[PDB]
Every structure is written in structure tokens, then in C-alpha cells.
Amino acid sequence: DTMKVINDPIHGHIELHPLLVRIIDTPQFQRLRYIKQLGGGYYVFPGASHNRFEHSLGVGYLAGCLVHALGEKQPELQISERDVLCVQIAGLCRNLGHGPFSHMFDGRFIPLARPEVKWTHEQGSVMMFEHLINSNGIKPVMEQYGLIPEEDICFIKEQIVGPLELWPYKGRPENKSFLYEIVSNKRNGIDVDKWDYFARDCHHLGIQNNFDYKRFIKFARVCEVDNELRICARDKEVGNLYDMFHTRNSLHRRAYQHKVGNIIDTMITDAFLKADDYIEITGAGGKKYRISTAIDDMEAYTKLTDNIFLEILYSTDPKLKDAREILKQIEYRNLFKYVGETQPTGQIKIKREDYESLPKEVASAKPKVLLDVKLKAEDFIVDVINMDYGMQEKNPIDHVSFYCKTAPNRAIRITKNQVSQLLPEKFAEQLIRVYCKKVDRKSLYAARQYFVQWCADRNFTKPQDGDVIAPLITPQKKEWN
Amino acid sequence: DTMKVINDPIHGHIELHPLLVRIIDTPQFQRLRYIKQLGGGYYVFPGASHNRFEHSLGVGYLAGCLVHALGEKQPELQISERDVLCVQIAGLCRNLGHGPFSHMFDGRFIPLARPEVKWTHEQGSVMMFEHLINSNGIKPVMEQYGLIPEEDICFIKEQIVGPLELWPYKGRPENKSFLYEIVSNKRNGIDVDKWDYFARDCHHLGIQNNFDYKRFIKFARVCEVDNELRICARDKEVGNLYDMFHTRNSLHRRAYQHKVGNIIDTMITDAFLKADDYIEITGAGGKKYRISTAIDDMEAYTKLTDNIFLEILYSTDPKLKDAREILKQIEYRNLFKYVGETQPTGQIKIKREDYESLPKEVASAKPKVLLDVKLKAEDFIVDVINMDYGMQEKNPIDHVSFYCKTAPNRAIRITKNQVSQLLPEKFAEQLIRVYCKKVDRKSLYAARQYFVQWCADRNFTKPQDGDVIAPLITPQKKEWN
Amino acid sequence: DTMKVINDPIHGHIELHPLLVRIIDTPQFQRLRYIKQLGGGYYVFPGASHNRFEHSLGVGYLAGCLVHALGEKQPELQISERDVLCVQIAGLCRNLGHGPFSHMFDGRFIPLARPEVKWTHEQGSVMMFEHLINSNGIKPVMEQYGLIPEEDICFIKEQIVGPLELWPYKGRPENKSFLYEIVSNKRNGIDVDKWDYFARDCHHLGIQNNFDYKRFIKFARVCEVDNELRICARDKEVGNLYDMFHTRNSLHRRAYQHKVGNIIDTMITDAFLKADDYIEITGAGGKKYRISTAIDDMEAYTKLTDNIFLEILYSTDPKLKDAREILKQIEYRNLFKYVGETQPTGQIKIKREDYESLPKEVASAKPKVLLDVKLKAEDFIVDVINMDYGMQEKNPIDHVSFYCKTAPNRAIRITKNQVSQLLPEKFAEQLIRVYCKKVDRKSLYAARQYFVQWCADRNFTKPQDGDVIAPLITPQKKEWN
Amino acid sequence: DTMKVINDPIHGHIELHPLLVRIIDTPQFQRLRYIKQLGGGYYVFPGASHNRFEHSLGVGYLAGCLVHALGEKQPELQISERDVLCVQIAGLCRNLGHGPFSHMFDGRFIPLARPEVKWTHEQGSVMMFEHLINSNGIKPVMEQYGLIPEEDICFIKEQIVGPLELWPYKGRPENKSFLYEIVSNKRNGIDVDKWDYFARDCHHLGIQNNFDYKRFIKFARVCEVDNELRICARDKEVGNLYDMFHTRNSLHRRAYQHKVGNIIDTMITDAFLKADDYIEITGAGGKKYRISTAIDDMEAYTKLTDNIFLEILYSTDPKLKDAREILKQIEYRNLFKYVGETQPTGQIKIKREDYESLPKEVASAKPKVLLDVKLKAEDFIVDVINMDYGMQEKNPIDHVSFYCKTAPNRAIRITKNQVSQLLPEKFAEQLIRVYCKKVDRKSLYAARQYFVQWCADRNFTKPQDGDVIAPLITPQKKEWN
Numbered sequence A, B, C, D: 001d002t003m004k005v006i007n008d009p010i011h012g013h014i015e016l017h018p019l020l021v022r023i024i025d026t027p028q029f030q031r032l033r034y035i036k037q038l039g040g041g042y043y044v045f046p047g048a049s050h051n052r053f054e055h056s057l058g059v060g061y062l063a064g065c066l067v068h069a070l071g072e073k074q075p076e077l078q079i080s081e082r083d084v085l086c087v088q089i090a091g092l093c094r095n096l097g098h099g100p101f102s103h104m105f106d107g108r109f110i111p112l113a114r115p116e117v118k119w120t121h122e123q124g125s126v127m128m129f130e131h132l133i134n135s136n137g138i139k140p141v142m143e144q145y146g147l148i149p150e151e152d153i154c155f156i157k158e159q160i161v162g163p164l165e166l167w168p169y170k171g172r173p174e175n176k177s178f179l180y181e182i183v184s185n186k187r188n189g190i191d192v193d194k195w196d197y198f199a200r201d202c203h204h205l206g207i208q209n210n211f212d213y214k215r216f217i218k219f220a221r222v223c224e225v226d227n228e229l230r231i232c233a234r235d236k237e238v239g240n241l242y243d244m245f246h247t248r249n250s251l252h253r254r255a256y257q258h259k260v261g262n263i264i265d266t267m268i269t270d271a272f273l274k275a276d277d278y279i280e281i282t283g284a285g286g287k288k289y290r291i292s293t294a295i296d297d298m299e300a301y302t303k304l305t306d307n308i309f310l311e312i313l314y315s316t317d318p319k320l321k322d323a324r325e326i327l328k329q330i331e332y333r334n335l336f337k338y339v340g341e342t343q344p345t346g347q348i349k350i351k352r353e354d355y356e357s358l359p360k361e362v363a364s365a366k367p368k369v370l371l372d373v374k375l376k377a378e379d380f381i382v383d384v385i386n387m388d389y390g391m392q393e394k395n396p397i398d399h400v401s402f403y404c405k406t407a408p409n410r411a412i413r414i415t416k417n418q419v420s421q422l423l424p425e426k427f428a429e430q431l432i433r434v435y436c437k438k439v440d441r442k443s444l445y446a447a448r449q450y451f452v453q454w455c456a457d458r459n460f461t462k463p464q465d466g467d468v469i470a471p472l473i474t475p476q477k478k479e480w481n
């Protein structure tokens, strides 16, 4: 075995060490070719045909770039080939746990199908990784290339999911703490995963990426912070970091949370729920699993991909008729109709436990307007989106360490006010989208009146088109005009 | 209904007329989302996740751009909105007949599964188009927007597949002849289909595109040629056109005929053949079809996409065991091994009827070298590739008309010698690739000796690495050294 | 004369009407080839070799695109070919008044050389335009293509500089008000000039552009607002507009106000001041002008370009020795040294009349630290930069009109709170940079102590590296720590 | 001093070793900021504002990339940091000898002004380099970083211009022969200089680059060939190399030899010739030089840049009136008129000594057509362009060595016939362009008749528009029709 070269449109020619090739050439990894990165986003942005596979290669490549760069600048860190390979493998493998249509599956479907469970793609990645290693005899190959499976497997998993519980990590000691900041940065979110998806998603979406990760890599250094060795950024690059999160937020606003992409994800989720009793996936020892239970057996999960969509769409079984009809309405573009968007005001924050009650509230509103139809709770969908800088209300740049050119080994902190007054005052907000499942002209007119009335009753912000869609409703609220 | 905007990474924001939206939002068209543009190419170029869907949008867009541009420069042509819509629809729909993995299906699978049939994606496109129109009530909508279904449906089909047999077309008269040169140019191959795939494939492959279609559109004009109105290019742009075909050939050499992408297509084709008896696809009136017969019923063909690959891979049926094993070997990257490449010499041309005899010839060669194993015909795959400028031995630029700035309405011809002596002397050639199905070190060593010996016996060109892979064989042939 | 095509790396093949060609092919316009778009920026960003010439072509092109797009969507506006040409010409000609090194000349040099004068490149553009027309016999050519010089020349000038003083414009009536929003938008700054520079500067700088003007053009419409016809943007595009200004601010932070690019501009300005007595530029009737007075005669101003830099650098005249030495220090990269950056706190705002007093304040600070050298006012440079969203403290999106899909003719307003809580709370700030003209190690150490002490005394923000450069100074200030 | 980072739009963030920074920050190098890469090309392609400075940085960067890559793959080569720095410096400095408007100066001007001299930019680069080193105290700095000035300066110069005289080089021995193939490859032309200009020129021209140098670097290796260690390319990459030269030839056809860019270069050259007696450039010890003699004194040559154009344009001296008028006609776009293009036939090859006789031949032709004016030799310009693959009639790929994956240390040769029959049969040709200095309609009509008659008399190829521009002349020649 020798090194392979892969040509990636985003990063160019990437070299893969033979051990990485071995990990990649397994059913568990190759599975990612059949999972769209952006789920339902492809149904709005036709360039977004890309899958988790190629993103994982990129993440693995960049993880290697950063660890190599640090080793070259700072030989005193004693970064070994072994460390590099482990960081690359964690990079390659942090997406292994994704399900059909990526975030649709763990963000919408599993929470509704198995409310009692607490599941994340991160956890799934660790489980799939263990399955990949054991099913394919990778441990001996790791030993052949100088890795120590016991410690290094633990390291790799910790890089993906955090401590499997004071230094809380066992795979490496504090003197190598900075290695835990590369693939999945739990401290402030600044990691190579973002860097790849910014660049790759932009390339495919047809929207231009504003963040320069190559620059960041050039200016990164390791310094001592509170008895840990951590990655620090050059002081003057702080603005670029603020911009990185701004870019992330723009991408969510323009693409990842696109109102129609989301309703498509929602429709697909509904079809999966209606199919979940009837689709069987064979796992370990021939045992049969459902879409919602395949997460319990990695052998079954290996075979759970976007393919399920087409299996349902092309099914002839009358049991799958309701699920199949939903997908067919997607194809004919008879989608649930977007009614509008609003936001909470002041300190008001909508809790997850209240999401189910919201359609009922909308249907209970009593707009003083003449209506041909009356709508019921089940006619409304309410989608609540939490937008933030990756740390709820917290500013991630408060959790970043910097260095200055006159003392490159001395770590410092930079506050928001030392950067600019043009920065956000808050770092989190919620958007509420409302859609109507009845798509005829009269139902939609009515849905608009209910929605705007509900916004007024709850003291939410005025929808942007409120005066046009509900001219009889908006004047009651002085605050709006 | 009003016009929709779609954002495409290649062309930007494309406007779609409501009638086009209606055609697009049907199962027949949306199907193209599940068919990879480059088939097995994705297994070599991980950026090439793109599907026929987005390519079709682009072709439809560019077709519109060119016809609009000509109408704006030359009002005297009397190009109508009706003409524009018809050309856009033909652009959109010329890929409707593609099967799983695009060219794999009509280039390898159908020829082996149904040798008696003569099938092409072009023919399939016309059938799928008719099916799309009839199944979805499109005719009334066409009338609503000023089209005349009888004439215009004929025009659209003729644009895709040529005369459905003097002027041989019925959908438009000779004064609109130039319209037939936009979507699928049967005269010289210069059409909007190439322009989109050059740009889109390059974007995804990570290889840079050298052809500027926007420039070409700016310099295009309609002039009278032999009592037809044809599209002419500005004289000085002739070099750019030679370059366009050079680019096409480079793309085939680097990507579309990549030796490993082709062997993956071949392995997938073999799995399909082994599954063909057992997969059933439901068509019109509940009748059941096979992969190879789905082409006879468009209702069934609608459901025949890349999904078949995963249906086989994930199958548990013991009947599908052999097919499923082939695909699994793809996942583990245990692929048939490439042995080498050579070309015929002089006037020698390999005929299609002789393709089957070639593995037998290779196995019959008697290299004077010590071999642990003897290989048989069934161990060898011989792939013959015809590379040309789109017209067999003919130079397509001999079939292009030009105009000069001093007389923009007078069409002229330009010969190769009026352009450059650095151009090709021939416009067609054949490549022969040999692979071995036995992948162990000793079988591959042997396969190399047989292959090189066969090249020598047939007086084919010396493989580039011949002296390295078969040092005992190459010296016998004086011609090589 | 017929239309010319130009190939631009940003916009592709641009078509130029013959009248535009005639305007372009004059000494007054071609001058712009010898004036760098980014001035001293090229000395930091080596890709920024681009000149005002090519930017002007782009602005003229985009101005045409927008006016054409609006006319095609809304024929009822009665936009004429004449209107289009006039808007294109204003676009082409709004940069004609730039001087050597663009903003350096009217932003730094003229204010210091001729404090009594009030001069702007805008004013210069109008003067140069009039000169161009009269010197080159353009009026007859304009009449030949259907323009009415009296009204249209007025219109063009008004588009550049605003009313040459109710409806305050004379070149077009209120029903064509929207035309005044294309080239130089005095209401909110959203114009084609920005669009071209964002794209072109980014292409040359090596920083990626986040704003999509093509999208914006597609969604733009004209609606009635307060008895004027104005350009409106689609409601949901409001986020993209906020982002456009954010992008502009990032470009200023990263590139246009780069600390070293600015000090280079400052050094060049100083050399020009020292040369201003001795360089003579011949204007109308052989009369001689200086660099600072060439603005009074357009014939002389025509010959005032970046060339002055080299004329000084290559001079042998002993009178120009001091000016020439400054430029030589640029070449050897012996630049004034950047000491640091800080900002005012609270309501504090530095007025233009106080800029001269600032070096003196820095030199008067009394840091309690042992210093080998004492520095004087003349050793310090203080550069005060006003950063905003183009309207001082005002939010430009408050001055934008929108429309919604359900009523495309009805203009509406959108507030900040209807968009996001992640937006800036303020839209303007000031940055203060300090540099030292003594570049030796001991002077620079001292300069750092003075600077930080001055920040503390004035209650400015703590410099980011303050604790490292002045550890003995920073602890006195509790606010900092 | 520590390493600097520069952001280049083509290569990204490039790191510069402190010694390189010192070389760059001198008047001799910074000079290159005032010399356009493409000369008169900017007057046709307005994006091509780029200068030799930024190209030199890129060449220096890529030279470092390649030497680093080879050292990392093959530690047994013993490539030292010293070797790397020397190769970078040669890359940085191989453009130091370019004159105003780059190839215009050594390709047109010097050959006409100083026919007796044999001058090339290469020679100029060595002289400027020596001047740079000596004038700026660089030798000590080189010693400080481990270079040995005697040997290393010799090595650097040899890399630029070849042996200054079996192994003909003194700066390194045969075991380091491969180092001489990086910056300026005298064997086959495949070097980092091309790679940068392909990418950078394309970026600025608005034409897309087809060659992937990063790929080439990844597949490059050093192997023993005829008792030298040389750079070898992977066998299968041979097609990409053919394509690289095809790309180079396309760029010449489309841009570098653009008919109008060339006539502008010719006009500028004529102005320089007319100014050469009167412009004085001050060199060593105050001595005065002319444009054509500044090459004899590097102090003077340091000050000879594109500035000369503007010095002439802006001059008031009546002696410079004729030169100044030529440049003014450029600004008004009153250029010499292109008449047509043709090529020699068969074995016919035009020698340099016959270039001067060609205008006379054109004027002596006797077209049997009625002409209002008779034209003289001095009215015609004949531009003869030799287009090739960099080695006259020779195929450079015959001078490239390859390796195969099965024996990476064994160098091999590949012939054209082992690659493709679609490759050129010849590797050199000549183009003849004719222009007329009389631009009125009747002169140009007449010029066309003379030109086509001359083509017919000389048995050159038929101009593409021949039948249109000279319908009475073309029928006499049966060969044409």
C-alpha cells in the first residue's frame, strides 16, 4: 500500500496515507456517499447535490493541514506522525453518524419518532467508528503504522464527542490539549469542520464564502493558557473571527434555514414517520429494524441512507400509501404553503416543550375579519429556529485566546469593545415560521389573518408584509403603527 | 403562476417561465435528481456528485440565452416568444431519457442485456417527453401560453432526436432552420448541451474549463447558407472552436474515460446483469418489468434511477447474492485491476462485432516468460474506446459557417490550413484498455506479460510502461526498440 | 461605428454602444489607466494593480444592466434608449475626477495643501466631464444618437454630484426619479459603483466577495413612494442588504484602511507636499500649475496621474531632494512604524479641527517608565478613521423601500427589529492609529509607553496588545484590569 | 527580522523568508511594480493591469514549493535550506531584467534601436541582480543565513541564464542537476515561470486556465537519467503536458499576439524610437543615458520603466513632438489599421533578415483592380510571428523524462505515438499580419487588394475574409477556388 491522491474541487489534490485509505474503503464510510450534506436544501438549491462523503475527506484533509502547520512552526510541541494520523482520522470520521438527509434525521425525525431517546449524530459517529474498526480489522493495520489502538481509539473518539466522562481526557495529556481543538472544538466552535463546509457548501450553493481558513492556519500558534497548551490566533485576526460567525449565520439565514427547504425537510420527516411501521432494515444476525430503531444496531444503520426516500416513493405496498403520497406531493411541488415569519420580543423565549402547543394557539386566534373558511390546529405548522453564534447567548470570541507579534508566546484575551462598536449586542435569537397545510386561495388568505392576529396577540414582531397580507389586522397594534 | 428564479452555481440566477416550471415539477423530470451525470466517475472524482437534473436546467437556460441573443441582434428573424419557449423546453428535456448512471446504462448495460435492440437516451427522451406531457395535462397549459401542441411538440421532439423521418423537418420551416442548431446540433455538435456540461463538470471535477460560451454567444449571427438560415460564428473565433473540441477530448481523457471510473461502470453493469432476472419494476396497469425491459414502459422507466444500485446493495434475497457481492467489492475497493492501454496502428480499426473476441486473444498470447499462473479469457476485460471530435473521422469545423466583420451577412467557410499547422491531422482514434479480474500479485504480473505480448503480436503501440512491466517481452519487437 | 465588446475579468464580455466608445477614447478618460484604484493599497496587497479605468467600465456596464432590467420588467416606466445611454455615461464618468492614488489625493493631500478649498472627486468629475465633452466634439455625436445635450448633460452631471442647486432635479422629472438611484445613490448609498468595486477589489485583493448584485438586480422593481417613482427591493432581500454594508465595512477594515497601506499613503502625501512648490504642470494656454492647483484647470488635471510619484522618485533636481528621500524610504521599506490602535469611549467624538493637536497630546503624556529617549510631537503621526455604514450614525436600511410578492406595486418599510437582533446597535465609530517616525528599537519602545499612557489618560479603549507592549502602564487603569 | 506573509490572489498566503524580504525591498526589485506584465495587452484586455512585481513573487513562491515537495518525498537527495533559498531567489529574480512594457522592449525596441547588440531580458536579469546585491549589502545577509555568496550567486545566475561558460555548471554539481530545471528549464521549458503566468495572466485577462501545476508538483520525482539526477513526471501525466503547451499557444493566439495589442506595442515602440535621441536617463556618477543605452548601466536601467510612456505623452519639448503625437493617436484610438493575416505554405520559412523587405513586397504587388490611391512601402507594417512549443520545430515532450508507478526510480521516454493521434504533426509555424498606416476608407480598401494579391503571388494561405475583402483578386488563384 502507498499513499493515494484525490482531486477535490475545494482543496485540490489531497494526499491520503494508506491507513486512511483503508478506513475510507469500508461500507461504513462509503455509506456517506448516499447522504446529502444539506438534506432538503437540494430541492431549493439545485447545485447542492453534494454528500457527506466528500465533506468528510475535506475535514480530514484540513485537520491534517492544521496539525502539520503547527508542528512545522513549533517543533518544541513534539507533534508525532501518530498524532497527525489520529487527528486526520477523527476529521474523516466525525460525520459517520449522520442519517438520511443529515440534520433532518437527528433534528426532526428522531425527536418525533423516539421522544424518550437522546440521540445525536456525534454519538452515532462514535458507534459507527467502533463498528467500522471492528468489522474491518483496522486495529492491526493501525499497529502496523505505529498507532496504539487502546489509547489512540480513545483519543479519536474523544476528539469527536468530547470526554467520555481536572484534565478530563485520557487519549492525550494536557501538553497535547491543543490537538482537541482541531476537529470538533468544544470550547468555542472554531474548527476545521466549519472551514470545509463554508467553502464546500458555498461552491455548491452558488453563494460566495467570506472566510479565509488558510490565512487563519498561517497565523495560528500554540501558547500556554491556564496550564494547558492551546491554539491561539494572532490578535489582529480577531475581526476575521467575528466575521466567520457572521458568515455562518448568513448561510443559515440564506440557505440552511431557507423557509421552503425547511418545509420540504418537514414533509420528508412526515413521510418517514408514516412509513416507519412498515419499512424493515436487516441488521445483525438477520434481525429486522425500523427507520427509527436502526440507530440501535450499526449493521442496520450502515444501510440507512437517503435511499429510504426512493424506496418509499417507488413502493407499491398499500400500507405505504400515505407516506408515498406525501413524497409525490413534493415531486409535483404541492408543498405546504409558507404563511409568514416573526420573532419574539424582549425576554420572551420559546421552550422546546411548548412547540407542540403553537399550532393550537394560531388556530385559536380571533382575527376580526370576514373568513370563508375556519382553520384548525392540524392545518398549521409552526417551525421554531434558534439562531446563534454556536454557544446560545454567549460570545464565542470571549473563549478564544490570542497572541501579539511582540510576544508570540504570551496568550491574551480580547473583549468585544476592544474590537468594534459595529458588532452584535446579542448572540442568539429565535425565528418562528408558520405554514399552512391547506393550500387553496381562501385557506391561505385565512391563514394569513390568523397568523398576523396571533403575532399581535403574542406581541411578536410585525411580519414584514403584515400590512399587505392583513391590512385589517395590523392597525389594532399601535406598536406596529 | 409567475416566473421562478433558481440559483445555479454555474449560471447564477436563472428565470424560469411558468410553463417550464410546470414541466419541471413532474415525476418524469424530477427523476433526474437521482441519476448522476458522470455515473461511476463519482467513485474517482468525489466532487462529481451532480445529477442530470441540474444539468438539464442549465441546458434549458443556455438554449434560451442563445435564442434571445439572436433575436435581439437580428429582429428581422421574427423569433417569437413561442419559438423561445419551445427551444427552452427542448433544452430542458433532452436528458429525460437517461438511465441509471447515465452513459453506463445505454453505453454498456443495454447493449449487453438486450443485444437485439437499438436504444439510445435520445429516443428515450422523446418517449419520456410524450409520457410527461400526457400524464400531466401539459398540452392545455401550452395552449394557455400560446403554443400550438401539434406543431410545437413535433418541433421539440425534432430538436432532441432529429427528423422523425429537401427540408426534412415539420415543426418549423427553413427560415427557422437555425433553431435546430441550438439544443442538439446534428450538423457539427456545437450546442448548448456541451456548454453546460463543460462548465458544470469542470466545477465539480476540480478541473478548469477552457471554453468561453458567453463569448461565442456574443459573436454568433444568423446568415443564409445554401438557402437555409444558419447560425454563423465570427471568422476569427475559429481557433476557439477548435479549442472547444480539444477541451472535450481532454475531459474525456482525464475524467469521462478515466480507466478506473470505467472499470467501476463495468462492475456496476455486471451487477445489474446479475440482478436483472430478479429486480421487478412496476409499470402501467401494475405490470412488472425488469431493469432491461423498463425502457419499454415509460411509467416503469420513471422509477428506474441510481436507486437500483442501493436496492441491490442492501438486498437480503439470496437470488441477488452474486450481484450484491460485486457491489460490495466496489465498496471495499477490491476492483478489477487495470493492466494497461494501447492503440491500433496504421489503418487498423476494431469493429464492434470483434469486441467479444478480444479477451480470448489476450489469453491466447504466448509470452516467453516464466509464469506461476496461467490466465483464461474470462479473467480479462478489454474496453475499446472510440475517441473523436464528435463526427467519427470528420473535422466538425468543416461543417461550421463563419462571417467576417466587413460583411456580417455573408457566410463563408474556413479550412484547417487557413487556421494553423499545429492542429490535429486526424480527428478519431481508438484506445484499448485491458483489465484483469484476478487481482493478486501473481495474476497481475502474468496479465501484464500476456497483454504486452498481445500488443506485440497485433502490432499495437507500445504501452507507455511496457519496458518496466514486461522487460522480457518488449525487446522482441524492433519497432519499439 | 458599431458596438464594441470588451472582456472584463469581473463581468465578462461587456458591449459598448458607439457613443460610449467615443467618450472612452479621449485623453480625459484614458487618464484613468494611470490612477490606481486602491492607491497605496498596492504596496500591501500586490494583486491590487488595478486602475480606475477598468472600474469605470464596470460601473458603466452595471448601470446599463440595472436600467435595462427595470425597463424589461416594467415597460410602463417608458425608459428610453436615451435614458439608458445617459445612465451608462454617468456610470462611466463618475470616477473622472479622481487624482493620483485616488482617495489619498482628495482625502489627505488637498485638505493639507489647500485647506481653504472644499474639493471632492465628485466635483472634479463634473468638471472633467464638461472638459471631455467640449474638448472632443462629443455634443454632435450625442445628437446623432438621439440625446438632447442641454437636458441630458445636466442629467448626467446631476447623477454624479446631485442637484446643481420640491423636485430639485432638472435633467429628468419625478416620474423618472428612480434613474437617479442607479449610479450614485444619495439617499442610501446602494448603487452600482459599490457593486463593481466589491467584486473587482476582491478579485484583485485576494479576498472573497459576499454580496450578490445580480440577485439584487433580479429582485429590483420601481414603486411609488411619496409621489416619486423609486427603486424597491424585495422584502426578504433585506438581510442581503445589511450584509452588503457589513461587507463594505470588512473591506475597509481588512484592506482599504490597512494600517500600513495608510501610512504609505501618508508618506506619499508628505512627499507630494514637499514637491508641490517645484513640480510644474502645463495647462491651458501654456500656463503652469502645481500639483495642488492643477484642480483649477482641467487641461492640467488631465496630466495629473500616479506618474507624479515616479517623476519625483526619478528627479535629480536638488530642490526635490526631501520629497525624493521620502519615496526612497518607501522603496527600502523604511516606513514610519505603527505603534498601535485605540478607540474613543462613550459619547466622545474627535472633531476634524482637533486632528492636528493629537501628536502633541501623545508627546505630552508622562508614562512612569524609564526611557532612554524622549520623543517630540513631530515624531508621532495620529490617523483618525471614521468608519460607518455610509450615513454617519444613520442606518441606511431605514432609507430603503421594499415590496412583497403578494402586492409588488406597494412599497413598504422594514425596521431593524423586524430583521434580526444580531445586527449592529450603532452604525458609526472612530479608530485612532498612532505611528512613530523614529524607527529604532529604543524610540519604538518609548513610543509604545507614550501611546498607552495617552490612551489611559484619555480614557480610550485598551489597545489589544497593551499588556504586552506596556506592562508597566496598563495596571494603573482599573477599567482595563 | 522574521518571515513575512503576503496575500496573492493567485497563490493565497505566501511566506517569505527574511532574506527574500531584504532582496525584495530594494529599488532594483520594486522597479517591477512599474512594468506591465503584458505590455500593450492592457490596451486590449483592461483586466491586465498586473505588473512584473507580483509575477516575480509568484515564481519565487512556486520555485520554493517544487523544491520543498521534492525534498519531502526524497530525503535521499539531501536538498538543503541553502538550496531552497537559492532556488527561491532565482525564481524571484528571473524577471529583473525586463524593460518598459516587458516583451515589447527586448522583442521590438532594442532589436530596432541597437541591431548590433544581442540583448535579452535574461542577460539583463543577471546584470540587475549583481547590481542589486552589490548596491544593497546583500552578501553579508546571505552569509548570515548560511549561504556562500561565491558559489550561490553563481548558482542563482546560472539558474536564470544557463552556464556562464560534460557538466557545464559551477554553482552545483550533477547530483543537484534537477535544481536547474525549476526556475528556467533550458531542456524542455517546463518550469515554474510558466505556471505562474498561466494562472495569473488568465485571472487578469478573463480567460480560464486549463493547466494544473499543483497536480504536476505532486507527481514529480527525481530519477537518474544519463548520469544526471533529473525531475521526472509520472507517465500518465504526459497528456497534461501536451495540454500545457497547447494552453500556452492558445494564450499567445488569443492574448499575447492579439492583432491590436501587437499594433499598439508597435506604435509605442515607434514613439520610443522617435524619442530616443531626446530622453535622458541619469545613471552612475550623474552620467546621462538614452532609452536604448540604459541597458549598459544598471543604475540607469533601474529608472527605466513604463513611466517613459507618460514622460513622452506629457512632454512639452518640441523635439518630442513626433513621438508625443504617436502616443496621442493611441489615446484617441486612431491606430494603424489591421488589413489581414496569412501563413506561409509548404517548407517556406521567413528569415529575420527578410522582415525589412516585406512592406516593400506588399507595395510592389499589382492587383488588377481599380484603385483611387497608390500605396508605398512605408504605408505598410508586416508583423511576422513565430509560434511554436518553445523549441522551434522540436517537440518538447521528447525531452521530458517519465516514471511509472511499478518502478518509480526508473526513468523512461514516451513518444508522441504512444500518447495520441490527435496531437499536432508540427510544432512550429509562422503568422504574418499586415497593417496599413493610412487609415482612411480608400487607403484601406487599396491595402486589402495589395495584401491579398501579395498572398496570391507568394502562395501564402488564403486570408479567411479574402473573398469578401478582395472578391476581384481571389478568383485568379485556383488553389483557393
Ligand SMILES: Nc1ncnc2c1ncn2[C@H]1C[C@H](O)[C@@H](COP(=O)(O)OP(=O)(O)OP(=O)(O)O)O1
Binding pocket: A005, A006, A007, A008, B044, B045, B046, B206, B207, B254, B255, B260, D212, D215, D240, D405
Ligand atoms: N488530468 C487530471 N487532472 C486533474 N485531476 C485528475 C486528472 N486525472 C485524474 N484526476 C483525479 C481523479 C482522482 O481524484 C485523482 C486520482 O488520480 P489518478 O492519478 O488518475 O489515480 P489512479 O489511482 O487512477 O492512478 P494510479 O495509476 O496512479 O493509481 O485525480
Ligand SMILES: Nc1ncnc2c1ncn2[C@H]1C[C@H](O)[C@@H](COP(=O)(O)OP(=O)(O)OP(=O)(O)O)O1
Binding pocket: A044, A045, A046, A206, A207, A254, A255, A260, B005, B006, B007, B008, C212, C215, C240, C405
Ligand atoms: N441570499 C440568497 N443568495 C443567493 N441565492 C439565494 C438566496 N436565497 C435563496 N437563493 C436561491 C435558492 C433558490 O434556488 C432560489 C430561490 O430563491 P427564493 O427567492 O428564496 O425562492 P422562493 O420561492 O423562496 O421565493 P418566493 O418567496 O417568491 O417563493 O434562489
Ligand SMILES: Nc1ncnc2c1ncn2[C@H]1C[C@H](O)[C@@H](COP(=O)(O)OP(=O)(O)OP(=O)(O)O)O1
Binding pocket: B212, B215, B240, B405, C005, C006, C007, C008, D044, D045, D046, D206, D207, D254, D255, D258, D260
Ligand atoms: N479568445 C478570447 N477570449 C476572451 N477574450 C478575448 C479573446 N480575444 C479577444 N478577447 C478580448 C480582448 C478585448 O477586451 C475584447 C475584444 O476582442 P476582439 O474581438 O479581439 O476585438 P477586435 O476589435 O480586436 O476585433 P474586430 O476585428 O471585431 O474589431 O475581447
Ligand SMILES: Nc1ncnc2c1ncn2[C@H]1C[C@H](O)[C@@H](COP(=O)(O)OP(=O)(O)OP(=O)(O)O)O1
Binding pocket: A212, A215, A240, A405, C044, C045, C046, C206, C207, C254, C255, C259, C260, D005, D006, D007, D008
Ligand atoms: N483580513 C485579511 N484577509 C486577507 N488578507 C489580508 C487581511 N489582512 C491583511 N491581508 C493581506 C495584506 C498583506 O498582503 C498580507 C499580510 O498583511 P498583514 O498580516 O496585515 O501584515 P502586517 O505587516 O500588517 O502585519 P504585522 O507587520 O503586524 O506582522 O495579507
Ligand SMILES: [Mg+2]
Binding pocket: none
Ligand atoms: Mg490508484
Ligand SMILES: [Mg+2]
Binding pocket: none
Ligand atoms: Mg508587518
